[PDB]
Amino acid sequence: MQPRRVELWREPSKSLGISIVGGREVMRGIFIKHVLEDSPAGKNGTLKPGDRIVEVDGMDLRDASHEQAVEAIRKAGNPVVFMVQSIISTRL
Amino acid sequence: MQPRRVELWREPSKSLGISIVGGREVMRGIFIKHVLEDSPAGKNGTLKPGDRIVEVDGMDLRDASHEQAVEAIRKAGNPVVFMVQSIISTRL
């Protein structure tokens, strides 16, 4: 599907509620591993496992390292603005 | 972590309870996207989102296409035997 914008509003003393994997190579891109249901990301509802993170707070992450992505997200203000894109998957 | 063996026992009229992403390139490797809690994969308990699928029922999937992996899993007997390896992730 098409790339889309996600604005995560931080909550004090809570993590955003995502885990990320990947980065600059079995998984070059940066992707969402998990989303905690009872969390900012869960409450948002539009960020999903398997979503590729293409930008965070204006910074291009399309050829980024795991560290650059982690850093971009941690140093983002509020809201944390992602551009994400879903990847094709198969249910078995 | 180390590669490990997972034996999924199929249940009649139920899907295995996994979704997979990736394949032969933002995600070259084959990885578990989702595991349904109330399913064979969920009941097993040892297969997790973010796990790289390296073999299925004896077939090497280390340079496999999405289609080859889907096919390997669908054509597997019972139990469906995976070799998987976790990838590093970061919680935010």
Q: Do A49 and B52 touch (CB under 8 A)?
A: no
Of all residues in chain A, the one with the smallest CA distance to B25 is A28
Resolution (A): 1.8
- Dihedral-angle region of residue A21 (phi above 0 means left; psi in -120 to 50 means alpha; beta otherwise): beta
Which among A6, A15, A28, A33 is the top mutation candidate for probing chain B, defined by the most B β-carbons within 10 Å of its own β-carbon?
A: A33
- What tokens appear for A62 in the block? 């399309």
CA distance A75 to B71: 42
| SS3 label, residue A11 | coil
| Separation in Å, CA of A16 to nearest CA in chain B | 6
Token pair listed for B75: 């054509």
Domains annotated for chain B, with CATH where assigned, are: 1-92 (2.30.42.10)
Please answer yes or no on whether B50 and A91 come within 8 Å at the CB atom: no
Torsion sign (Cα): A67, A72, A78, A82 = negative
Q: Residue B77 forms beta bridges with which residues?
A: none
> Residue written as tokens 């980024």?
A64
Question: What span, in angstroms and rounded, lies between the C-alpha atoms of A34 and A51?
Answer: 10
Mapped to the 3 state alphabet, what secondary structure does chain A carry?
A: CCCEEEEECCCCCCCCCEEEEECCCCCCCEEEEEECCCCHHHHHCCCCCCCEEEEECCEECCCCCHHHHHHHHHHCCCCEEEEEECCCEEEC
> Quick check: B73 and A13 in contact, CB under 8 A?
no
> What count of other Cβ atoms lies within 10 Å of the Cβ of residue B43?
13
